[PDB]
C-alpha cells in the first residue's frame, strides 16, 4: 500500500580509529538531509566502535553491526551474539555481505540462519545477496540471487524488519562497470521473485537497496529507478560524500 | 624464571550488567604481585571499551581475535591497528573454536600472529589436537605443525605466549591429567629449543588451555613446563581469582 521509505546504509567495513570516528560522526551530526519520513539512514562501524558511535551519533541516524553470530552466545571465541547488540541498543545488523560470503566462506544457509536468529532477538537486518563475474558470465545472475534470497525466505516468517541489499560483486574490483539499467534489472527480477515465492505484500513493502559503486554524481540516476529503494554504501560511507548519497532520497 | 600467566577468555558471553559485576569482582581481588603473575582478561569486541575503561590497570585486556592483515574491505572484521588504537594490548589467536568452527588454518593463524605482533600487540597463540588426532598418536605431530606455522612468522618472541588446548578433553568425556599437560608442554618447549633457540624455549610462557578450576589449578600450575592458564567459563566467575592465586605454587 504505502511507498517504500528510501534507505541509505553506510558500511565502514574494517576501517576506523577513535580520531577518524569522531571526525566522521561530527560531519554526519552537522549534515542537513531529508526528513526521517523521506530517508532511513544506518551507519555500520566495526564492533569495537559501536559504543563510541551509538553514544555520539545524531539520534535520527541508526547504528548497525557489520555481522553477528548464527545463534545464542557461549563457546564461540571471537564472535558477537545478536543479544549483545540488543544489550548495547544497536538496532541493525548487516548479514551475508559479499566479503563474508567470499573471503570467510559464509554459505547461503549460514546467512539465512543468522538473519532468522537476528530477527528473533528484535534486530533489523540488511540481508546481502549478489553474484560473482563467473556467475554473471555463466548466465546465473538470477539463479544465484534467487537461491541466496530463498535460503533467507525459507527461515523468515516476518519481512517487516528486513532490507535486501543487491551487491553486483561482478562489478566490484573486476574492471566491469554496472549501469543503472543493470541495477534496476536485478532489483525488478528480485522483487518479482519475492511476489511469486513469498507474497505480493512482501514484494511491495520490502526495500531492495543497491550495494554497487555509488557516489554523489550517480546516486540520483541509480536512485531514480522503479525498484531501487536506496544504497548500501562501501568506502564513500567514511567520507562527506555519504551526505550527498543520503540527499539522493529527494529523487523519489 | 618465566612469569606465571593467567588469561581469562570470556568467549561469546556478557551484557553491560554482567561485565560491570565481573570487573567489580576483579577490581576488589587481592592476588599475587605483578612479579609473580601476569593477568589478561578477554571480553567480546563490543565490551573492550567498557572493560579497558573500568578494569584495574594492573590487569590487561585482550581481544578474542583480529584480522590477518591491514584493514579495508573486510566487513565484520577488526584489525590489529584498531585494537592498538583503543589501547588493547593483547589478542588471542588460533583458539580451537575458531580453528574448528570457523575453519581457521594453521597458516591463517600464523599470519594473524605475525601481523598482530607487527602492530605492537602481545599474542596468546593457541595450538591443540582433537580426540581423533590424539587417538591416532598424532598429538606432538599436530602441536609441532601448528606451532611451526606460527614460529615461521614470529618477529618478536618476547610478546608471544603459547596456549596448549587439549581439544580431545573438551566435551568428549576425556579428562586431561597434569602429567599429560606436562608431557605436551615439555615436548613443545623442547621443539622451541631445537627449532627456534634455547633462550626462546627457556623464556616463552606455555599456558594450559584445558578445563581449569579452583580445584585443579595448583596441580596443573605446579608442573615444571606449565606457565599458567587460558581459562574458559570460570573466567566469568569469582573462581577466576582462585586460579590467579595458583601462581604462588611457582
Outline the structure in words.
The PDB classes it as isomerase. Keywords: Triosephosphate isomerase Crystal structure mutant dimer redox regulation, isomerase. Chain A is globular. The longest helix of chain A has 18 residues, at 180-197. Chain A is α/β, with parallel strands linked by helices and 252 residues long. Chain A is built from eleven helices and eight strands. Chain A has helices at 18-29, 50-56, 82-87, 98-102, 108-120, 133-137, 141-153, 180-197, 200-205, 219-223, 241-247, and strands spanning 6-11, 39-44, 62-65, 92-95, 124-129, 162-166, 208-210, 230-233. Chain A has an eight-stranded parallel beta sheet, with helices on one face. The A-B interface holds A 11, 13-19, 46-52, 66-67, 69, 73-81, 83-85, 87-88, 94, 97, 99-100, 103-105, 234-235 and B 9, 11-16, 44-50, 63-65, 67, 71-79, 81-83, 85-86, 88, 92, 95, 97-98, 101-103, 232.
